[PDB]
Amino acid sequence: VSLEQALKILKVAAELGTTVEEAVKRALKLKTKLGVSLEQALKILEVAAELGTTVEEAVKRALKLKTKLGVSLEQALKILEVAAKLGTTVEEAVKRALKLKTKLGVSLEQALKILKVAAELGTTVEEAVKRALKLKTKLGVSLEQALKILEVAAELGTTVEEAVKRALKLKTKLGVSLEQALKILEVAAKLGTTVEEAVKRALKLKTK
Numbered sequence: 001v002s003l004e005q006a007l008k009i010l011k012v013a014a015e016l017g018t019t020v021e022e023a024v025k026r027a028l029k030l031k032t033k034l035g036v037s038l039e040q041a042l043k044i045l046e047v048a049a050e051l052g053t054t055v056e057e058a059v060k061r062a063l064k065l066k067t068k069l070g071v072s073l074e075q076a077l078k079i080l081e082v083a084a085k086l087g088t089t090v091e092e093a094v095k096r097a098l099k100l101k102t103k104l105g106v107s108l109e110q111a112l113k114i115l116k117v118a119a120e121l122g123t124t125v126e127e128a129v130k131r132a133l134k135l136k137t138k139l140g141v142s143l144e145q146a147l148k149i150l151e152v153a154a155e156l157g158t159t160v161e162e163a164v165k166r167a168l169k170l171k172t173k174l175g176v177s178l179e180q181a182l183k184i185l186e187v188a189a190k191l192g193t194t195v196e197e198a199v200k201r202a203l204k205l206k207t208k
Contacts, residue, residue, distance in 0.1 A: 012027070062076045145178060152167070170183070
């Protein structure tokens, strides 16, 4: 059990309002029923809790999208998730994700993350791009990392500079990457706990 998966578990349980044991059971049931990875199974459970629908409907609509557009399951699930957060149809979420790809030269995956981040911030797309591009240039991070920093600052209710400060203090305290430090911070905020506590549980959970 990876630290990323363990953190993903804590977070999904929180999103679901269950204990982690119950979340895990639910995720292992799906994994077997679909022959998917644990990572995928948790993504499906996350999307149902963000859709405010059933695990079963999420799955149903995802495979419909998979077959319809020929995308991966992950991609189908982000699309469903972005459309929900945008309040739009998936046809419309896909149209905007393509107009962003063209407008910037980025992948579908990246377009969709931008759209989601703008939605979460309640900012325009153009303004989210501006903020992400500025971090990209100030710290030499990838686009995706710039976007993770944006969300986490929001989640915390602090500035991206203080988000960055803390994440770097974690890379240092624990010897993890920047991505992992951002996940841990996202996860402690979501759980409403200190990062020490989140990590302790994550390590504690890493006997699954």
